[PDB]
Assembly symmetry: C4
Homo-oligomer: 223 residues x 4
């Protein structure tokens, strides 16, 4: 079954994405004496990891690897409700297993937050929600624009375009909100670490941003 391949692809893509990218956040200075945070390192790993997973799985599942993307696809009727529930389940499960593998292989002294996304202390949850909405909006707009079959003018790698959209979300928002853009990516390490601080914003922010982008693309700009 093509469908079960696709669901398995979403699970595996998420597992790999989350393991590698959360892995890039590990501060090898430790919790007691943290080394400087390399924002470029993290932003590139998240962006290039998404580019790589879209390259690997785009033709098998569509390479959503993100519940907010899947929800935008449901709301624009590009995927069935039935398919969307299995994708979102696979994405959340994949994120849990990827984060769990990271936990198992990472020395306890440097695990730290295991890459959980958190709102800066000097931000409100409302401002964090807005940041996540906007960064996810631009990501989902990039996905819809890049994959639009009506276009004759798309050039170069679609996967890389999407990955660089992820990268810019991070280069801006890592210190504001952790730059989630992706409810499953936040969910995975939240489950492993039992850290649920403002967790709802990482569902509501990205999902609203994604649906707005998909809606604006499909029904306002390029119907």
């Amino acid at each position: 079954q093509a469908f079960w391949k696709a669901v398995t692809a979403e699970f595996l893509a998420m597992l790999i994405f989350v393991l590698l990218s959360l892995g890039s956040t590990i501060n090898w200075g430790g919790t007691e004496k943290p080394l400087p945070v390399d924002m470029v390192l993290i932003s590139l790993c998240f962006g290039l990891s998404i580019a790589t997973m879209v390259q690997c799985f785009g033709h098998i599942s569509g390479g959503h690897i993100n519940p907010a993307v899947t929800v935008a696809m449901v709301c624009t009727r590009k995927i069935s409700i039935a398919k969307s529930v299995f994708y979102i389940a696979a994405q959340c499960l994949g994120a849990i297993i990827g984060a769990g593998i990271l936990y198992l292989v990472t020395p306890p002294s440097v695990v730290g937050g295991l890459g959980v996304t958190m709102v800066h202390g000097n931000l409100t949850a409302g401002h964090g929600l807005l940041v996540e909405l906007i960064i996810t909006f631009q990501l989902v707009f990039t996905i819809f624009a890049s994959c639009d079959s009506k276009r004759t003018d798309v050039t170069g790698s679609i996967a890389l375009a999407i990955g660089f959209s992820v990268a810019i979300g991070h280069l801006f928002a890592i210190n504001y909100t952790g730059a989630s853009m992706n409810p499953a990516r936040s969910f995975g390490p939240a489950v492993i670490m039992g850290n649920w601080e403002n967790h709802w914003i990482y569902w509501v922010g990205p999902i609203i941003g994604a649906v707005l982008a998909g809606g604006l693309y499909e029904y306002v700009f390029c119907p």
Copy 2:
């Protein structure tokens, strides 16, 4: 109307570009004790943000997202005067709103200059003008060369080519002039912060550079 979609696209593209990219300049060490400035972080965010916005909006508006680009297009008769005034208005308005959103979500202690472009103290305004002229020249030349329909040899992503031209402008000029290349990008945070220091060079420099590049491309090299 296709035209109103295009104007709205220029506004939205600028808003997102400016929010994310100015956001990358925020020094989370604060004004009292600034951490080292990561020039790669800023250069990549500006370059990849332009690449992403061109990917998203190139087919809707042409993805100028820059009054100097729009002026070069007017002077080479690629866009009408009428259209250019609405584009430039949308670009300036979008930059103001993007910078304003950044101001609202950024803790006051780290707002700093809000990414306003300023001439180094040990540079003259004249040398700043020249720097901005040259970096904008190469950017606009890249745009005209990449989009030239006569060419059969353009390979890979046009958006990424343009974004990397933005990136190199920054990797050179951030410490000289702030590497504007873009009058609206300078205008937005200037309005929010009331900081107008040498502001005219960020209009005159890029506009002259852009018109020279467009003119040289269209009428000297590739007529």
Copy 3:
């Protein structure tokens, strides 16, 4: 003979890849007073070096430049056993000569480990094996997905896709295992320096990961 060209290409590609990339690991602070380790610098050099060598030699040899890739190709019957033995020999020999050239041109005071891949002291060899398995899995999956002739949807540079897969392996795993993904790349400097610590994991980990990826791609996802 096309075959001897291909074998010579694998040797030369490996030599250049290893010289440049191990060269990027040299800590010019010295063994006594090491400067901060730039993980981005190393990750980009390894990834972009593979992208460059695939660009240069992909059409001559297939651009494996990696015994684990070659083994995956043997197990999926994409290359003959006979050809695979000469490729693996050329790859190991090329890595030795590249690492040897690096040793000759590098001041003894900064040679350090000559970029040998080692397991972190706070990791077990088993966890190192798992890390190497997973990072090599995603790399080999990227190679099979990117080169799949059945696909009509691959966009942009195949070489760059593969290089960025290498880059993410590093951005995650440099501090865990040295991010080998490549038995020959580990073998070369091991020979020059006589450093064989946990060396077997850099054969077994990548080879298992590669065969699993090739097998899953060819027989489960995209038969």
Copy 4:
């Protein structure tokens, strides 16, 4: 005349490349108290600047922007001797003017070496020559492989492939030799600063590497 356009393009491409890229080397800490050297910043600026100039001028002049490339093209009979002398003149002149402009706009306190390429004190000139030979070899091989009309399999941006080859040359060799790969790029700031230390290696090394690569590509691998 197409020929005079091409010569002017080589001059202008070199001017811009050298200004921006040497500009990226300026240490704003000063000669008295230098800040850490960002190798990624410099490597990306040189690589992306070449990618950008090849994008801008490849169809006008061939985008050599490098006397060693031009010599390799002469030796493989891809360009006439007559044309090669004007290209090399334009390249050297462009490099002088670009470096001179940089000197004029850069505060005297941070000019430093103006990005002159020098051999590390703990390297011999012979080892510097070898480093320059190898890094230029891989660059020129990338150019010949990327531009080979017999190939049906080249994917993505040729300009970016070449630029990333430049980038890896730097990520390896900046601290060894300054990673010239380009006699004109070394010549320009040497003229402005009157700094000729080991200057001959930056002609002989790259030229030998370039001719070997061109020769091997055209006559051994892909005749």
